[PDB]
Amino acid sequence: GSPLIGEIGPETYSDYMSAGIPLAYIFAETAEERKELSDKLKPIAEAQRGVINFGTIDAKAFGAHAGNLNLKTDKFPAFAIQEVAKNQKFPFDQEKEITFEAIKAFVDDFVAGKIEPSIKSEPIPEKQEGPVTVVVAKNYNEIVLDDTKDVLIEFYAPWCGHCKALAPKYEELGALYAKSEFKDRVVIAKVDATANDVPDEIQGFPTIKLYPAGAKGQPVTYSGSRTVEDLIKFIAENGKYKAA
Numbered sequence: 601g602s603p604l605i606g607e608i609g610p611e612t613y614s615d616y617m618s619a620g621i622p623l624a625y626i627f628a629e630t631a632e633e634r635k636e637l638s639d640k641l642k643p644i645a646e647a648q649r650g651v652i653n654f655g656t657i658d659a660k661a662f663g664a665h666a667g668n669l670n671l672k673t674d675k676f677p678a679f680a681i682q683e684v685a686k687n688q689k690f691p692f693d694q695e696k697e698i699t700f701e702a703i704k705a706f707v708d709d710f711v712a713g714k715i716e717p718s719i720k721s722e723p724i725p726e727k728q729e730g731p732v733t734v735v736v737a738k739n740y741n742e743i744v745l746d747d748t749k750d751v752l753i754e755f756y757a758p759w760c761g762h763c764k765a766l767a768p769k770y771e772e773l774g775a776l777y778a779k780s781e782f783k784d785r786v787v788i789a790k791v792d793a794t795a796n797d798v799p800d801e802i803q804g805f806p807t808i809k810l811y812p813a814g815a816k817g818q819p820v821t822y823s824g825s826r827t828v829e830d831l832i833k834f835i836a837e838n839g840k841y842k843a844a
Contacts, residue, residue, distance in 0.1 A: 608655035627678040670718040688717035732774035733789040737796040750839030755793040782843040813840035
């Protein structure tokens with residue numbers, strides 16, 4: 601009982617996910633605009649039967665889902681494609697008008713493999729304050745892969761109980777190094793890996809690695825007791841600068 605451009609919602613989402621082809625989302629705040637945009641994009645959906653499923657989504661009720669398509673919050677109408685298989689997101693520029701011509705070119709590019717998957721990132725923080733350096737996807741290379749510095753990097757999730765138990769100690773470690781004679785050469789850093797796409801393949805949280813100066817292709821994964829004392833030892837034993 602459903603039209604070519606269906607409705608993406610609580611009842612329909614799992615079938616869209618199990619269909620095994622990508623899903624294009626037409627976000628609009630009102631049903632009227634949803635219908636207008638559906639009519640404009642229908643010939644694209646028609647041409648892509650069996651290759652991409654298209655659907656409308658209620659941006660009033662489900663606006664927060666735009667973020668999970670690496671779209672910007674609260675800028676509608678909006679369009680994006682989700683490659684379910686590879687978990688990749690292809691947002692369409694929300695400063696641009698959604699038209700038949702623009703979306704057709706975007707979709708053709710997608711099918712042709714001509715668009716690079718978007719990268720999820722928090723923004724670069726304006727100021728670097730607090731003794732633990734905040735890493736996001738956009739500054740990972742610059743901070744973590746800085747070949748002149750021994751970089752301790754914690755990959756964490758905010759919903760994780762273990763990460764919460766580590767936080768105060770990891771902070772105390774950062775404050776210690778920031779006041780030490782090693783403040784020039786040791787970096788103590790953290791990254792919310794659920795809010796940033798990072799290169800590392802993380803199996804569970806928290807994970808801590810050392811990326812030593814001059815050996816950035818051989819990070820060392822930490823597997824000790826997670827005490828401040830044991831982390832200092834780890835840094836001194838595995839870092840280029842033997843910094844403790």
